[PDB]
């Protein structure tokens, strides 16, 4: 809990992982957490993704040389007391002024 997150709570939670020279880098939902390996699903590697999309990834923490959880799952359920956009989201490019239409 205060260092090593390792359990059930995380499941479903969106984290990259930085693997060693030789594994690369892949990002993708955990579908299963235990102490010895991580498993994700939907295994997108190098940016592009992987054609076992279906196919879930297992890779052993002893191999995985750091992770970052990206999108923690969601507490407050937010009854539309902001607009429908999120800053956490990536912004390619900032929209100046409004458009004529919105929505």
Same mark, same amino acid.
């Given at each position: 809990g205060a260092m090593g997150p390792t359990d059930? !709570?995380?499941?479903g939670c969106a984290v990259s992982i930085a693997c060693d020279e030789v594994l690369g880098v892949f990002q993708g939902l955990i579908k299963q957490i235990s102490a010895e390996e991580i498993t994700i699903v939907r295994a997108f590697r190098n940016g592009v993704p992987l054609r076992k999309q279906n196919a879930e990834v297992v890779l052993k923490c002893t191999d995985i040389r750091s992770i970052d959880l990206i999108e923690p799952a969601?507490? !407050?359920? !937010?009854?539309?007391?902001? /607009? /429908? /956009? =999120? =800053?956490?989201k990536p912004t390619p490019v900032k929209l100046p002024h409004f458009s004529n239409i919105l929505g």
């Amino acid at each position: 809990g205060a260092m090593g997150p390792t359990d059930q !709570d995380w499941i479903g939670c969106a984290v990259s992982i930085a693997c060693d020279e030789v594994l690369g880098v892949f990002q993708g939902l955990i579908k299963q957490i235990s102490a010895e390996e991580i498993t994700i699903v939907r295994a997108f590697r190098n940016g592009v993704p992987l054609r076992k999309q279906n196919a879930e990834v297992v890779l052993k923490c002893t191999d995985i040389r750091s992770i970052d959880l990206i999108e923690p799952a969601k507490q !407050d359920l !937010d009854g539309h007391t902001a /607009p /429908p /956009p =999120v =800053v956490n989201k990536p912004t390619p490019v900032k929209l100046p002024h409004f458009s004529n239409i919105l929505g």
